[PDB]
Write a structure and sequence with these properties.
By secondary structure, this protein is mostly helical. It is 66% helix and 0% strand. The PDB classes it as metal binding protein.
Length: 312
Amino acid sequence: SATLKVSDSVPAPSDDAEQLRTAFEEDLIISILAHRSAEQRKVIRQAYHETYGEDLLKTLDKELSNDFERAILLWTLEPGERDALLANEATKRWTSSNQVLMEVACTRTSTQLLHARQAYHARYKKSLEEDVAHHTTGDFRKLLVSLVTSYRYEGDEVNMTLAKQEAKLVHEKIKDKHYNDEDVIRILSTRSKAQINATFNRYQDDHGEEILKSLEEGDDDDKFLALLRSTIQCLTRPELYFVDVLRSAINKTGTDEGALTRIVTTRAEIDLKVIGEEYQRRNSIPLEKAITKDTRGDYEKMLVALLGEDDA
């Protein structure tokens, strides 16, 4: 599900560092970084630091940051630190509309979320939980906190019996529109993804309609419902959530800033390919084309290259 195309043969890290050093003092930045594995990128920064006694990304942390710079930053950081950074920004100016915390918590494996929590300790001298719990409110806080603290079991075991009872419970609640119900939050934040999927399968069978369809009758301005919706999507079929967010970003309709750069950089090495396929089906136009639709500067260039479509 990865789009990133890594050179089956890459030069020595020191040579990449030298070139990158020259490029930083632009198609050379794309040619290199967008075609290196996370491991190789790690080595490159490391070699760069040894040679110049300065981190390659030092000039990009700045928030008076250019889109292209921003993309380089997110992409060249280690996944854990990147997620810690994204989570931190989400908490700094949180609003009922921000769902990035949920995103990082539900589209990551338990291990990746742990790395994010550890990188968070190192970079911010605090735990992700305390900040989320500190700056979020009401029901939003109850779900977001439960989600970021989880360290889910990832095996395939499924307890069909439990799946049916909890499917029952979730229905009795969504029914009277108690989206913020205690058990609903518990199930989505504690059960494994396999068990949750089985729970919603039983939900659909035992009651006829699909879970998301069920929630479509609710108010569209209910920010919590919107959050619960995305939560269910990200735990079930993430691509569905990512495609919708990509849609609003490109159509400059969203209130989710940096969404485009975040999605491409955070998923390129994971499931961007499947996200792309879905984007194409849902819009008829390939994602790389939608990105280079009006402009094609270094920024758009970097993104399409991460999508494996350099000349798009």
